[PDB]
Amino acid sequence: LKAWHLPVAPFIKEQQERLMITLWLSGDDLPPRVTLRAEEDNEELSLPMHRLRQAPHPGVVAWRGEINLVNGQPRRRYSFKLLWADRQLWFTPQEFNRFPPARLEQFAVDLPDSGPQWVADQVFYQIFPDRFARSQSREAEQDATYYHHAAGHDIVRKAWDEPLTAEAGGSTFYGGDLDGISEKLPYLKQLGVTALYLNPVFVAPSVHKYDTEDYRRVDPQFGGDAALLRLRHNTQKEGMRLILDGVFNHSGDSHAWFDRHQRGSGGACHNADSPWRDWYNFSPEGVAHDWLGYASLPKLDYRSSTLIDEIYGGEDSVVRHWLKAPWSMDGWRLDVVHMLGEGGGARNNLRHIAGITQAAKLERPDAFVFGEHFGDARQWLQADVEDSAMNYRGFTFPLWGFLANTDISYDPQKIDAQTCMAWMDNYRAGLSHQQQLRMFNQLDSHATARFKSLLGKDVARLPLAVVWLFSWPGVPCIYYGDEVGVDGNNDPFCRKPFPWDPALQDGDLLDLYKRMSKLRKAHQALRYGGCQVIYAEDNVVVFVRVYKQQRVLVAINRGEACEVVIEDSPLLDVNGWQLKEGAGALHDGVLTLPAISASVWFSR
Amino acid sequence: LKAWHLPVAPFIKEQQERLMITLWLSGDDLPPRVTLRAEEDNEELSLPMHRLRQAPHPGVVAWRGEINLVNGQPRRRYSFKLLWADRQLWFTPQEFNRFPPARLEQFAVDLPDSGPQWVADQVFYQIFPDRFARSQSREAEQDATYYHHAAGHDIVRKAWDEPLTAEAGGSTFYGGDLDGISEKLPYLKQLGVTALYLNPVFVAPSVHKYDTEDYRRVDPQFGGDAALLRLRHNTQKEGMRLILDGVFNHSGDSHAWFDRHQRGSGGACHNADSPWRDWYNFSPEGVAHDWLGYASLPKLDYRSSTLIDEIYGGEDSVVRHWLKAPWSMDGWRLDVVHMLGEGGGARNNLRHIAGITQAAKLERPDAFVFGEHFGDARQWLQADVEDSAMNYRGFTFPLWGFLANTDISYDPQKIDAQTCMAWMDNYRAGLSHQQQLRMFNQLDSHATARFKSLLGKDVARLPLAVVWLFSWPGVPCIYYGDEVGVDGNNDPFCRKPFPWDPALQDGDLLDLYKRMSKLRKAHQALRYGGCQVIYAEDNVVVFVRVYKQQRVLVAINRGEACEVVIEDSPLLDVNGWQLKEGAGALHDGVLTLPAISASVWFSR
Ligand SMILES: C[C@H]1O[C@H](O[C@H]2[C@H](O)[C@@H](O)[C@@H](O[C@@H]3[C@H](O)[C@@H](O)[C@H](O)O[C@@H]3CO)O[C@@H]2CO)[C@H](O)[C@@H](O)[C@H]1N[C@H]1C=C(CO)[C@@H](O)[C@H](O)[C@H]1O
């Protein structure tokens, strides 16, 4: 028995107040009855399906039923209950199940969809501002050294060509700034970038600036408020989106609310009468607690109602401040989204993350709010407390395992294509189709080793991850310099200054990024399409994006040259295929795949 | 490779502010390193494990690590990361995983546990009051007929021996009352019952009374307030718990807040100025909406702040009213728990169910709050918005499939022991050990066909479900009359009057219930123990409850006589076994199991 269904046209279609659901079956012992098991206000419904007279494809039988859209919540969950005289079988995002699937692992479609629909149309680029580009006209005022109290020494200035070292990793400045990003927008635009995610830019003593000192003012070293306001103008003018790093789990210990180094008068660290005393945790004798290992990053206590108001509760809150005029940013990347909470830990985390996302959409209804999840984000996404997550668990780490033999802990990993796709497909199963389309996918970040370094001897697999990055469901994010071949180990060495000298750039890898963003811009199924893994064994993964009549076929081979027979899939029943990238060859259901390759085909 | 771990002593042990975690491995290619992958404030931690010098059992290697209890939230989630030089493997509640388990499918232990710890010590009995027992001294005033407006005719009185029929299914009264329950407490106590769950008892015109007319007054037909207050006294006196049906998704249309039949003056159905107009949904022209198919059961709209206060928000709320003096009930069974919400559907359902549970524990900290979930309750339980659920998905329906060949929809079901246990074990995987211990397990209810009827030709399998009911993790609930062999199809025919004539009672089945409640009372592992399925194939399931040094082995065979070899399991390495129930025989790792049997062994 075989079955096909994707939560997307041609398999679903909205018409009047109805959502039409089609299932495809094929086999010798087809079920005489199929029931669409859908959910309406969390109640399980048995919706009858009827057999369509016309075969959608040779030897395939189509069933159709419908979900009433006038009732129920927007997230339409369903699966298929295949019924014979004596038995049943479930068809799910994870193929066949012999017992009922988990409610939160069904197919799901958001109708109506209230999420940020612009996200799926984007190509993202992550910039660590100190290390991206120095503006042509920066004051040496922005080059001045000061004493970094939390570190115990003066900050260090380095020149763009000086080697990055482990010493003073948080206090070494190469001087990149926001005007530098503005001036490099034409580079970013010819890369295909339509959206920027910036690491923190607010006033802070370290170079990374997660040690926030002032949530209301841009750090002068980056050019201050005027330079970010210009970056807002320039990106708007170029139709680009701009997301800022939201660091709300914790402040820096130089913030005026805490003020450990007593720059001012009212800080909570050394004053029991401080207005912000209840925004931080203290020992019974009144000594401020460290957060994890960090004196520099005291944790904010969302037990306090006034803290709740300051961050997201009130109209004057930090979360809404940067979303209205004049800043009008497009949303927030939430740092440490999973640990924010009350009493020094993640207590009531889900309530506060929801409160933040809600406050964002009050100020700006199409605001994009997504959180950094090294871990399993499914509970957050399944309760809709945020729009998306940095998809380390659903995308990054499966590719670390399959291509680079490592994982989140940099432990040995040995997983073949079957395991890799069961992993990636199991993660998506917890997400609606509209959620899958906006998952924030990347290969590395400011908080990981460079993916190119993680490949080691297998660095020739890097072009595979690039193609995969642009073709797996979700919005892709390029970590700055990845595209020109920047490498390095984990923090601090993953934050090398961008090599603007072309002699220091992998020009071929950069072109591959350019072509892939063009393909994604060009073809709807790479932005809106369902996704069916078709073959996943040993070294070879083959999947197809599916949107209406269009198909995009992707074949990734991490190992030696081989041939892979694709059994006649009704998803691949098209007029013909046009190869768009890679040197693979499809002919008569046989994929001839060269060693260590990734190929993309468009249906013609 | 083989592994064992249960979230219970001997595998875990609290000592100082530390939780010690032990894993057992056995095989030819053991991992030289194992990492305890635990969670602290949602952050994934790699806690090293070390090899113990002493083998817990022959050919078994023990690893140990520890979770720091001073930090993190009470729910300690973890799994095991087996590490070799070139690869890794995960050990989980669901055996080995090749890619990381879901965060909410790890092992989990609640330390500290704030749940109702008395629940695991109970045997529950569900009573539909009209059909249980008429008190020796009931007024014929309680026998009077009235007109049931929602039905269109007078209620009907029947005698205890009159056959139950489909006519007037909601308006036919056999006259059982609360004093009748009181007078039958000695029967219930010699059955082993320690706790009662009553279907609704508040003033309502139907016989089932989910059409609530007055949340503050007991229906006179059941004996009114004094009869329930006596039932409170009598159960307290006998050390028994008392749970009431909480019907808060919807009221009856005869309630004064709605008042469709205009008994009074201010109802919301026919008065736009009504104080409760915003507690119900109306068409733009102001006509009250039906809920699902029901005019009689208008849905309550938790959008309204004053409704929130009336039900659970205020100190005078319905939820807290019955939990303080003089009522001092032990908690609430929440009817339609999954659909309660705002605007006519389940919008913000999770917030309101949590609000209800919170209000219960304000009034009464060890209150038990659990909801009727025909569906998958995992999201509710995983967010802790309730203590437990009627475990239809985790217990009832797997036993319907494996023993009775049917399911929630009364569709044909054909599932063997492998599928049945993968199903039951997958559900539990989403639940902490303390949550598993308080899942509300039963074989049928007032809302299903009688399980004995569902077995059909295979009714001889009924004793298997009984033994299973008392030995699978969770608190068992007997649906009244099940124990004496009452049968019948779905509602109305599942609510037959209890046969108090012994000539109409299955005396053997009643004794089996008596013995099983005694075993459960006697042996700690049947109330607190972990649970490891040991064998699950074809007709045979074998599992063991595990608590400290004690073991309870259960072997269920739904089919022909057979022998089952139990490979040497270190969980079964004991001095010897004492057979307590059933005619199975264990000798030298070989189970001789007669046709259609269930057997229980205690370790000696
Ligand atoms: C002092 C450090 O500040 C930053 O790191 C913070 C920040 O809030 C965030 O990046 C957080 O990131 C991750 C997730 O929260 C975890 O889920 C994941 O498992 O681990 C991630 C990173 O650990 O981590 C920090 C809060 O826990 C900044 O990004 C870092 O560079 C930090 N390091 C300082 C200090 C050292 C001293 O040796 C230097 O190596 C480094 O270069 C400095 O910048």
Ligand SMILES: C[C@H]1O[C@H](O[C@H]2[C@H](O)[C@@H](O)[C@@H](O[C@@H]3[C@H](O)[C@@H](O)[C@H](O)O[C@@H]3CO)O[C@@H]2CO)[C@H](O)[C@@H](O)[C@H]1N[C@H]1C=C(CO)[C@@H](O)[C@H](O)[C@H]1O
């Ligand atoms: C009118 C009916 O009132 C009661 O049923 C309600 C009640 O709130 C609750 O039992 C609810 O139960 C279930 C769950 O909510 C669902 O998840 C599950 O899938 O379906 C369950 C039962 O349908 O169902 C009702 C709210 O939807 C009372 O228990 C019933 O007896 C009801 N029936 C009346 C009416 C008919 C007319 O033919 C008679 O057959 C019956 O004997 C009457 O009592």
